[PDB]
Amino acid sequence: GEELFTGVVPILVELDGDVNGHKFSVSGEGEGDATYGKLTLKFICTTGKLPVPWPTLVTTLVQCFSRYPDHMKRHDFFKSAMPEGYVQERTIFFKDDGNYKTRAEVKFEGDTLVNRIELKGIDFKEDGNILGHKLEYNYNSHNVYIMADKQKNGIKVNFKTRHNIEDGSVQLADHYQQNTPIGDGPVLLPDNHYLSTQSALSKDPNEKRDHMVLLEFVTAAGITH
Amino acid sequence: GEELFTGVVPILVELDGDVNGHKFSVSGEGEGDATYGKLTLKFICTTGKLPVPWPTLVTTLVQCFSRYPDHMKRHDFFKSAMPEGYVQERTIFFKDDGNYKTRAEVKFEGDTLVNRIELKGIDFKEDGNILGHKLEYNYNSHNVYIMADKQKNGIKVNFKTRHNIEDGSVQLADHYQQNTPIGDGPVLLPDNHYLSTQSALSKDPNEKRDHMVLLEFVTAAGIT
Amino acid sequence: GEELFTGVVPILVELDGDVNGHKFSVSGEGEGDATYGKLTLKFICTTGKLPVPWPTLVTTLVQCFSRYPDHMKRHDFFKSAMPEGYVQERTIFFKDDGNYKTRAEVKFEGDTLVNRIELKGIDFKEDGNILGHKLEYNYNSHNVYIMADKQKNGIKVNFKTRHNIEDGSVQLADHYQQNTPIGDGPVLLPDNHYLSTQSALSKDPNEKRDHMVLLEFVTAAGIT
Amino acid sequence: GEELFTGVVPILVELDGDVNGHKFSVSGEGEGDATYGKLTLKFICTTGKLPVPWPTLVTTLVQCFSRYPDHMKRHDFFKSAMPEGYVQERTIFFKDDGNYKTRAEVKFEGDTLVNRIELKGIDFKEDGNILGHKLEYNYNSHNVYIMADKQKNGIKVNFKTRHNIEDGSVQLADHYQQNTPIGDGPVLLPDNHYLSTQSALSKDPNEKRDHMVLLEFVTAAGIT
């Protein structure tokens, strides 16, 4: 599955969601270079105006493109489950607000890596930072902690994200994630480690549609040479 | 059988294998000069791309071409079994990985020496050095220890090969081998000894097919 | 950023590479004089013997030093991205052989212009001109073609290099390159043009380490 | 490899042989001046009396000392393979008699050019000109024809020698030779040509041991 990430791979992303009764859809296209843990993606909201702030969907909208140092490659679960893929699930808790439940399947469809996602958000405050759109248009760096779940034959992941708010405060979100292989093949279960991630959010000036462009860098770490 | 190795002899090699369900085939041609313990062989993978690293097949892919010093000629089992030939079997254990079971018949077909081989590899890690293709394209020198097995009227052989890995480590492979004659004629059973072997691996630049070219020198020793 | 290239500027270069599994490193130090489009650089292989020929690394191992004629100064992308720098990426295809995927960041570290580089080579023939080391120790002149990529807010470049081979033939390498700014400031997008380049390769006689000394002249052209 | 042959170079020669079961050894020392295609060598039989006539060993007992005219220096395979050396092999067929199978490595050991040789002789008539020692103690001039074997990255050579016999007749010997490089470096493959050779055989009057002294001149030709 690692021989599939040697060059630039095209990515296609589709999400169908509902937040407090609000339904919307997003589509995305881009590519990734696992060689530099590099991602470039543009997303559009197909249903009109996105009901939630864009930064809240960054973590939902492809960790098989992380950069794994040569000594740690036997710890790359995501690429070992390829091409069949893996399911990725999450419950994201926004402090003092709602939460998202998400289920997605990430796999190879021909030569494109697709990420089909489903999302339900419940309990959002009508005048919170989220439904109230008080988040600012930017992102911070974060470290994603990973460990093997030998029972489900996958990995469990937990991490928190800080989102800057307009007024000067910060909105936290706790992420609980699990990944399981689709294929019956043996995957690589990793020793404990983490992923350092950095993203930048921007807009395409010639774009009339509600969208978000994203540049991200992901590198693996936390295991000794 | 020794009077057949006085000059250059053409060699014909055929392997049919399966490794963890992967099937492939190899064909080889070349010649050998018993007089200098020399061998020149080129092999091609006829099924497309070889699933295993080429250096893992070197030992399977004709010891009757070793140089046996004058004083040690009564210890040359290989040649004595000729022209009828001998069956050569092996179980090669790759440390922390799978293993190969091989069975072959080496004999004279007309004036060509042919080596007909069958190989089955089981238990290979999907991310080991072998299926993961981490072996480097080279070979080291080794010594093959030989002793008579008077009950099967043949010889038993054991030896180990070190294969360099790109990351810097080494992959070991223990070899357990037995050879028995095909013919009903009396063979030479040897006293304990070993063969000193040196090989060089290269490529033919005008070759599009998956292949390996091999130069090898084998000399007998260990008997006073 | 142009006000930084009025004199001689010290250059520091560092490359970490991997070619068909082979890891090596190189360091370089020198200076450039933008005013004459002149460069002097000496590189050493810190890991011992360089596994690939030195001429194959020339293009990877600082175009902000080109001489841009007065009328053409509004087309100097490279200097406009300074001091923050620009990312330079490339895929170099060697005819009938492997290719190099390279990524680098060129920017000012204090008063030194550093070019930090990463290189990966895949698919090289084991007996090609490259791994087989058949390239002669010299370089030819070439023109590098440039155009703006208003999309990535950078430029796209493509050119080809001829490398002399010992036997008398020539090895070609097609270069595809993209440069993008690191800073959020506005850069100069150029009209189409090219850079005329001339280089000379030599050795430092008192140097025991594997190295290459390089003299190069770069001048911008093609705009009326 | 050419810069090594600018002056006088000491040569050291060692041959271990067997002719129809007869084992003997020879040692030789001397020097060669590539600039004049000049050679002076003295050989001794260390095992006692040499079992075969001395003139039969001349061609076996260092062609990298041939003079190559200036316009023909790109055709010098022998010196380009230096200092790593080359392997030289031969089957010499004596008309109506046995034949010699020889293998040799010629290379630089420090500052001495060494020629280590191995020879086997089979099928010699017990009443022939060779074992019967009927050859006269002299040598003739000959032309050695050369061509590239781009296959083996070497050269093939064939030539014949006439040996005077005491009764008035002549003994012919057909030489089939192949030279291949030891080093992995690129060598010069030549266009067809030949070497003109002249030798004189004599004895050292103060020498009690079986020996042969040899003066020989070799000059390259056949290329416009």
Side-chain angles (χ1 to χ4, degrees), chain A residues 1-2 4-225, chain B residues 1-2 4-73 75-224, chain C residues 1-2 4-115 117-224, chain D residues 1-2 4-115 117-224:
Chain A
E2 164 206 81
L4 303 165
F5 291 95
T6 31
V8 172
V9 181
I11 308 171
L12 171 55
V13 178
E14 259 125 70
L15 164 158
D16 266 279
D18 166 325
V19 168
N20 271 21
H22 308 114
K23 286 158 184 295
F24 61 90
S25 276
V26 170
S27 225
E29 303 172 44
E31 39 194 52
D33 203 343
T35 314
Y36 301 119
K38 182 198 178 188
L39 296 177
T40 338
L41 275 318
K42 182 186 169 182
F43 302 94
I44 309 272
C45 186
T46 72
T47 59
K49 294 178 181 186
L50 189 89
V52 285
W54 276 115
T56 69
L57 303 180
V58 176
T59 49
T60 302
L61 294 171
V62 92
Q63 313 174 299
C64 48
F65 286 112
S66 293
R67 183 192 192 154
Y68 267 80
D70 264 90
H71 67 289
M72 268 193 279
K73 287 172 183 175
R74 277 202 144 106
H75 283 110
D76 205 337
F77 164 83
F78 314 93
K79 288 182 190 66
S80 76
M82 296 303 170
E84 295 87 2
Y86 58 66
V87 188
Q88 180 168 299
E89 310 181 80
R90 286 200 184 109
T91 303
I92 304 179
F93 300 92
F94 288 92
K95 206 206 172 208
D96 292 330
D97 228 333
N99 68 92
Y100 294 171
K101 281 162 182 181
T102 78
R103 200 186 66 211
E105 278 167 27
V106 174
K107 51 153 175 267
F108 271 91
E109 274 179 35
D111 66 1
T112 300
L113 183 294
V114 302
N115 177 32
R116 267 161 224 305
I117 322 151
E118 206 141 79
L119 176 157
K120 206 169 193 206
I122 68 234
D123 298 339
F124 292 89
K125 290 184 173 189
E126 207 54 66
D127 232 25
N129 303 290
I130 294 101
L131 287 180
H133 291 238
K134 295 166 208 181
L135 274 73
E136 278 183 0
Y137 196 58
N138 53 35
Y139 223 66
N140 297 333
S141 290
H142 309 105
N143 289 146
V144 164
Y145 285 81
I146 291 174
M147 70 173 333
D149 179 330
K150 292 176 181 173
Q151 188 200 249
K152 306 267 195 61
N153 193 46
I155 62 178
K156 290 178 158 281
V157 177
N158 168 247
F159 68 93
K160 174 179 316 179
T161 66
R162 299 172 301 284
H163 301 284
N164 305 335
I165 300 170
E166 291 199 337
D167 70 352
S169 45
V170 164
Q171 174 61 69
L172 279 356
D174 217 330
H175 283 64
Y176 285 97
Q177 155 183 359
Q178 166 115 45
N179 276 73
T180 24
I182 283 168
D184 303 305
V187 303
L188 263 27
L189 260 27
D191 277 7
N192 298 3
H193 68 276
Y194 70 105
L195 302 168
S196 188
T197 305
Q198 310 124 61
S199 344
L201 308 197
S202 62
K203 295 291 175 182
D204 178 338
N206 300 316
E207 190 49 71
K208 305 302 172 191
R209 292 164 307 181
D210 201 358
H211 69 308
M212 164 179 89
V213 173
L214 176 81
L215 179 57
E216 209 154 80
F217 284 89
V218 201
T219 320
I223 295 165
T224 342
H225 285 269
Chain B
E2 216 160 51
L4 301 171
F5 295 91
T6 22
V8 171
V9 187
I11 301 161
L12 182 53
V13 185
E14 248 122 78
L15 164 151
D16 271 275
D18 168 325
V19 167
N20 275 18
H22 304 112
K23 292 158 178 296
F24 58 94
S25 295
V26 179
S27 261
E29 301 175 42
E31 37 191 44
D33 204 342
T35 305
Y36 298 123
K38 184 196 155 177
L39 285 171
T40 340
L41 278 312
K42 179 187 188 188
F43 302 101
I44 309 265
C45 186
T46 68
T47 65
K49 290 177 183 183
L50 186 77
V52 285
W54 279 112
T56 63
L57 302 182
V58 170
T59 59
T60 307
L61 292 161
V62 116
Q63 300 169 330
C64 46
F65 289 114
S66 293
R67 186 196 198 142
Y68 266 84
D70 292 68
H71 71 291
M72 256 195 274
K73 285 181 177 173
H75 286 97
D76 202 346
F77 159 80
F78 311 105
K79 292 188 190 68
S80 75
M82 301 289 175
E84 301 82 8
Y86 54 78
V87 181
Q88 179 166 286
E89 312 186 76
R90 284 212 179 98
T91 308
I92 297 166
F93 302 92
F94 286 87
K95 208 199 164 222
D96 292 342
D97 232 312
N99 69 95
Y100 291 173
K101 291 171 205 176
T102 76
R103 206 187 63 211
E105 283 167 29
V106 177
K107 52 151 181 276
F108 270 103
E109 266 174 30
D111 68 9
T112 298
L113 179 289
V114 316
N115 179 37
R116 265 159 221 312
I117 319 156
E118 203 141 65
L119 171 159
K120 200 181 187 190
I122 58 216
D123 303 345
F124 292 91
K125 293 188 171 190
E126 208 50 64
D127 238 340
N129 308 310
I130 298 107
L131 297 181
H133 292 238
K134 290 160 203 175
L135 270 65
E136 296 189 328
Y137 196 65
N138 54 55
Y139 222 72
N140 298 309
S141 285
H142 310 99
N143 300 111
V144 180
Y145 286 82
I146 294 164
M147 77 176 325
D149 178 351
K150 293 174 182 173
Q151 182 211 255
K152 308 264 198 66
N153 197 50
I155 61 196
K156 280 165 167 296
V157 177
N158 173 249
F159 70 96
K160 181 175 303 180
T161 60
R162 294 174 303 291
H163 305 285
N164 305 339
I165 302 178
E166 289 170 5
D167 73 350
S169 59
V170 156
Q171 182 53 66
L172 268 18
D174 231 310
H175 287 65
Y176 289 96
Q177 153 187 353
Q178 166 126 54
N179 280 58
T180 40
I182 283 173
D184 309 302
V187 304
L188 250 21
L189 255 41
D191 277 18
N192 304 352
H193 70 272
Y194 67 104
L195 301 174
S196 184
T197 311
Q198 312 122 50
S199 323
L201 308 188
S202 102
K203 300 277 183 190
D204 178 354
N206 300 310
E207 189 42 70
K208 304 303 170 201
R209 302 166 298 186
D210 203 5
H211 70 306
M212 168 193 61
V213 188
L214 171 89
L215 176 57
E216 211 169 72
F217 285 94
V218 209
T219 310
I223 284 167
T224 319
Chain C
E2 152 85 77
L4 307 174
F5 297 88
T6 27
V8 172
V9 183
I11 302 162
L12 198 43
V13 177
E14 252 97 49
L15 171 163
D16 276 293
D18 175 309
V19 170
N20 285 23
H22 308 113
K23 297 151 179 304
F24 63 79
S25 282
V26 172
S27 259
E29 303 183 33
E31 41 191 64
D33 200 348
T35 302
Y36 299 105
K38 184 182 186 190
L39 285 175
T40 309
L41 278 315
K42 180 187 175 177
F43 305 92
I44 321 288
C45 177
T46 68
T47 57
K49 299 177 179 181
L50 191 74
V52 290
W54 279 103
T56 61
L57 298 174
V58 168
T59 48
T60 307
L61 299 167
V62 95
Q63 306 164 332
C64 44
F65 285 110
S66 305
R67 195 183 97 54
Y68 266 78
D70 179 79
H71 68 289
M72 271 187 263
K73 270 185 180 171
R74 282 172 174 186
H75 291 108
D76 207 332
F77 164 78
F78 313 102
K79 290 181 185 63
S80 68
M82 293 308 159
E84 296 95 6
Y86 57 65
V87 186
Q88 182 161 294
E89 309 181 267
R90 276 207 183 104
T91 290
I92 298 168
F93 300 94
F94 287 86
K95 198 164 163 264
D96 289 336
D97 228 322
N99 62 118
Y100 291 162
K101 205 184 196 303
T102 88
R103 189 189 147 98
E105 281 171 32
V106 184
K107 58 172 163 230
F108 272 108
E109 281 300 331
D111 66 349
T112 305
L113 186 292
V114 303
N115 168 45
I117 321 155
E118 205 144 62
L119 173 162
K120 185 156 180 163
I122 60 228
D123 302 348
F124 291 89
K125 289 190 174 188
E126 209 53 70
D127 281 3
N129 312 296
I130 292 101
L131 292 172
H133 292 255
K134 292 159 190 186
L135 272 59
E136 282 171 0
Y137 197 78
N138 51 53
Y139 222 76
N140 289 305
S141 293
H142 302 113
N143 289 97
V144 175
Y145 289 90
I146 297 168
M147 70 184 306
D149 175 336
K150 292 181 172 168
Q151 173 229 331
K152 307 268 198 57
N153 195 48
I155 56 173
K156 291 176 156 286
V157 187
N158 161 269
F159 63 85
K160 188 173 297 181
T161 59
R162 296 177 305 293
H163 300 289
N164 303 327
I165 302 183
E166 303 264 312
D167 72 341
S169 61
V170 162
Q171 171 68 62
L172 270 22
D174 219 347
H175 288 69
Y176 290 97
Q177 151 181 7
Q178 171 97 45
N179 286 73
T180 48
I182 295 164
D184 307 303
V187 301
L188 260 32
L189 267 15
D191 274 359
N192 311 346
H193 72 271
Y194 62 113
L195 299 182
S196 189
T197 305
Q198 309 128 48
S199 317
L201 304 188
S202 70
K203 298 288 184 192
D204 178 351
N206 297 311
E207 189 46 77
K208 300 307 167 204
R209 295 167 299 184
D210 202 3
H211 68 303
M212 168 192 63
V213 179
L214 173 89
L215 175 56
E216 206 168 76
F217 287 92
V218 186
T219 307
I223 288 184
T224 1
Chain D
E2 160 175 30
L4 309 177
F5 296 94
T6 32
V8 174
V9 178
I11 309 157
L12 206 74
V13 183
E14 257 84 55
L15 166 155
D16 266 282
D18 175 308
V19 173
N20 287 14
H22 305 104
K23 298 156 170 298
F24 67 90
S25 302
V26 175
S27 274
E29 299 181 23
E31 32 188 69
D33 209 338
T35 307
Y36 299 106
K38 182 167 180 169
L39 277 176
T40 327
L41 277 317
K42 182 182 169 174
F43 306 95
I44 317 281
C45 184
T46 68
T47 52
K49 292 176 187 179
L50 193 80
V52 287
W54 275 107
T56 70
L57 298 169
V58 167
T59 58
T60 302
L61 294 172
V62 93
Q63 299 165 327
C64 49
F65 283 111
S66 293
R67 200 193 91 55
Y68 263 79
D70 191 76
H71 70 291
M72 272 190 260
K73 287 200 174 185
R74 294 168 162 205
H75 294 100
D76 206 334
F77 167 76
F78 314 111
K79 293 182 186 70
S80 62
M82 293 298 164
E84 294 87 357
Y86 52 71
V87 175
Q88 189 172 288
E89 305 177 275
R90 289 203 182 96
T91 300
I92 291 160
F93 301 95
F94 286 91
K95 190 168 172 266
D96 293 329
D97 223 320
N99 70 110
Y100 291 160
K101 198 179 193 191
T102 71
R103 185 207 155 79
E105 289 174 21
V106 177
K107 52 157 163 271
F108 270 109
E109 287 287 15
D111 63 357
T112 313
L113 184 278
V114 319
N115 176 31
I117 312 152
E118 195 148 65
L119 169 160
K120 176 94 187 197
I122 63 232
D123 303 326
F124 289 91
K125 290 183 174 189
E126 208 51 62
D127 254 345
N129 307 295
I130 291 83
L131 300 179
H133 289 261
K134 292 163 197 184
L135 273 66
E136 278 181 336
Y137 196 70
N138 45 42
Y139 223 74
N140 292 314
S141 302
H142 303 115
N143 294 126
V144 160
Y145 286 81
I146 289 159
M147 71 186 310
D149 182 348
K150 294 180 178 170
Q151 177 216 330
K152 309 267 198 61
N153 194 48
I155 68 177
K156 289 170 156 291
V157 185
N158 165 265
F159 64 92
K160 192 176 299 172
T161 69
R162 292 173 309 288
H163 300 278
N164 292 327
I165 293 179
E166 250 132 36
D167 69 343
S169 38
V170 159
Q171 167 69 75
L172 270 12
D174 226 330
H175 289 62
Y176 288 97
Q177 157 184 342
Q178 168 110 48
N179 285 76
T180 31
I182 289 178
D184 308 302
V187 311
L188 261 35
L189 248 32
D191 273 9
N192 309 336
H193 68 283
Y194 66 104
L195 312 174
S196 187
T197 313
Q198 309 130 42
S199 324
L201 311 190
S202 65
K203 305 278 184 192
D204 182 346
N206 298 311
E207 193 49 268
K208 299 311 166 200
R209 294 162 304 175
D210 199 6
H211 77 299
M212 162 174 89
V213 185
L214 168 88
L215 175 54
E216 199 168 274
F217 284 94
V218 189
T219 310
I223 299 179
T224 17

